[PDB]
Design an enzyme around this catalytic site. Structure first.
Site, mmCIF file in Angstrom:
data_model
loop_
_atom_site.group_PDB
_atom_site.id
_atom_site.type_symbol
_atom_site.label_atom_id
_atom_site.label_comp_id
_atom_site.label_asym_id
_atom_site.label_seq_id
_atom_site.Cartn_x
_atom_site.Cartn_y
_atom_site.Cartn_z
ATOM 1 C CB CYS A 37 -9.015 9.553 2.218
ATOM 2 S SG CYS A 37 -9.329 11.431 1.787
ATOM 3 C CB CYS A 40 -7.679 11.790 4.446
ATOM 4 S SG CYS A 40 -9.516 11.963 3.744
#
Length: 116
Positions: A37, A40
């Site tokens: 991600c 992330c």
């Protein structure tokens, strides 16, 4: 930090989360995330740096929602990264989306003395 004084950050799982996070005497910051991600990966250096630098004030841990959905439903993950700060194993605050070191450490400084 060494192999016995294990380098930051730790990782948590649904069978151990209650002993690692909820049994702690500390401020414990938990990131519910996936390793592919974008936002992330944007917080990966930030969580590593605060956790390496401030290990005597707080602990930072990560939960991998890509392989463990059971703790991800436990804290109602819906978008990632989900960052949630506990103190003495009790929740204080949640934010969703990316951070910088200054914002993460300021919202931590709201929970234990630092910017004083």
């Amino acid at each position: 930090m060494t192999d016995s004084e294990k380098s930051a950050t730790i990782k948590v799982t649904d069978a151990s989360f209650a002993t690692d996070v909820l049994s702690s005497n500390k401020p414990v910051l938990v990131d519910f995330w996936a390793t592919w991600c974008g936002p992330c990966k944007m917080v990966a250096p930030v969580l590593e740096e605060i956790a390496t630098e401030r290990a005597t004030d707080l602990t930072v841990a990560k939960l991998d929602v890509d392989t463990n959905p059971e703790t991800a439903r436990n804290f109602q993950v819906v978008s990632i990264p989900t960052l949630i700060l506990f103190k003495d194993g009790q929740p204080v605050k949640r934010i969703v989306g990316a951070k910088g070191k200054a914002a993460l450490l300021r919202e931590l400084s709201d929970v234990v003395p630092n910017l004083n």
